[PDB]
Write a protein that binds this ligand. Structure first.
Ligand code: 5GP
Ligand code: MN
Length: 349
């Protein structure tokens, strides 16, 4: 029994084209797509106003396809999971920094998180790396002055994710830019022939943040977009797979994985516990996280019995199933934070 997972690189707002290719696959092969994974540049612009939050050169200030799906005119034929890249409606993604559905069948994993589906554990890390913004907090509500910095990956995600492989392995990890140095771990001479511009960066190509996370969790698969090319590499037990850009034939590939249990999309318990236990660092809605707190120190307080109570409370107020919520994203921001705070304060500390 096997499941077929579509892995997609850069979408850049070409949703109808993406879903067509996926459909062409299910007919070319007669195989069923279980769900879709996307590695960023989703450009989930709801309406014209969101263009302000899209960091692109002027000629790429375009609405794209997403609003069609936001409006219900079009409907995603598959459950689609994604992280953010460097070309996003960053205001929308900041509202949903704790993850959320942007529309039917399209789930954003947030700044970072781990989810559960079909017996698999999947980790996502949004954004691209810029050293000068790695320690920068998020400011809320979103502001047009931060269009150039909202999509930069923060250092703290490392401490947020580092313990996730303690109780079970990670099957798939997602990032937009490549883990730094992994370019040297495939046929890089061949890669440079197709992509001569990459040779200059050498082993420094990619995100040092994703490099750390990969080395720490050692997932079965690490999948990345950003670089506009197909590429495979092996870092120890980890299969690295880079994907291209929609419109070109290197953008989509497929994972054929053993299917033990068919199971709806669910929150990962270990992630949920980290989420609750780090609440003090995220308590200021105007500016988070406050790094006068040590994320590691906060997470060190997790215990078997506390985790059990947390998951019990999460199931009660939110549910383990990740379900579609059609409330505006500003409402979802406040709502999810309300329950995280409620649960933390119920533990007693
Ligand atoms: N040499 C080099 N090129 C990069 C690097 N990061 C991004 N690029 C180039 O910039 C493009 C970014 O595409 P976009 O993010 O606009 O979809 C990549 O496809 C790649 O050609 C990098 O670190 N080094
Ligand atoms: Mn990109």
């Amino acid at each position: 029994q096997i499941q077929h997972i579509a892995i997609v690189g850069c979408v850049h707002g070409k949703y109808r084209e993406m879903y067509r290719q996926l459909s062409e696959y299910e007919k070319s092969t007669g195989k069923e797509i279980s769900f879709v994974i996307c590695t960023g540049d989703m450009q989930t612009l709801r309406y014209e106003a969101d263009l302000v939050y899209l960091k692109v050169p002027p000629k790429y200030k375009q609405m794209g396809d997403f609003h069609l799906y936001y409006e219900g005119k079009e409907k995603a034929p598959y459950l689609t999971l994604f992280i953010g890249g460097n070309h996003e409606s960053s205001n929308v993604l900041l509202h949903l920094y704790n993850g959320g559905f942007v529309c039917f069948n399209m789930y954003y994993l947030g700044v970072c998180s781990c989810i559960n589906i079909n017996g698999l554990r999947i980790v996502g890390v949004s954004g691209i790396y810029k050293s000068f913004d790695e320690k920068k907090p998020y400011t809320y509500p979103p502001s047009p002055n931060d269009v150039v910095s909202l999509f930069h990956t923060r250092n703290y995600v490392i401490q947020m994710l580092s313990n996730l492989s303690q109780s079970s392995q990670i099957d798939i990890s997602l990032s937009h830019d490549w883990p730094q140095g992994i370019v040297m771990k495939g046929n890089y001479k061949q890669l440079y022939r197709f992509q001569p511009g990459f040779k200059k960066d050498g082993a420094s190509l990619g995100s040092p943040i994703n490099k750390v996370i990969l080395n720490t969790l050692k997932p079965k698969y690490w999948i990345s977009g950003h670089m506009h090319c197909e590429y495979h590499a092996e870092e120890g037990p980890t299969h690295f797979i880079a994907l291209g850009k929609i419109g070109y034939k290197n953008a989509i590939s497929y994972l054929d994985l053993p299917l033990k249990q068919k199971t709806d999309l669910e929150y990962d318990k270990d992630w949920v516990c980290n989420l609750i236990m780090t609440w003090p660092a995220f308590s200021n809605k105007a500016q988070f996280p406050d790094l006068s707190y040590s994320i590691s120190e906060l997470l060190s307080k997790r215990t078997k019995e506390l985790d059990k109570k947390i998951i019990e409370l999460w199931e009660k107020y939110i549910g383990l199933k990740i379900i579609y919520d059609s409330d505006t994203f500003d409402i979802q921001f406040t709502s999810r934070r309300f329950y995280i705070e409620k649960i933390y304060n119920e533990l007693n500390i």
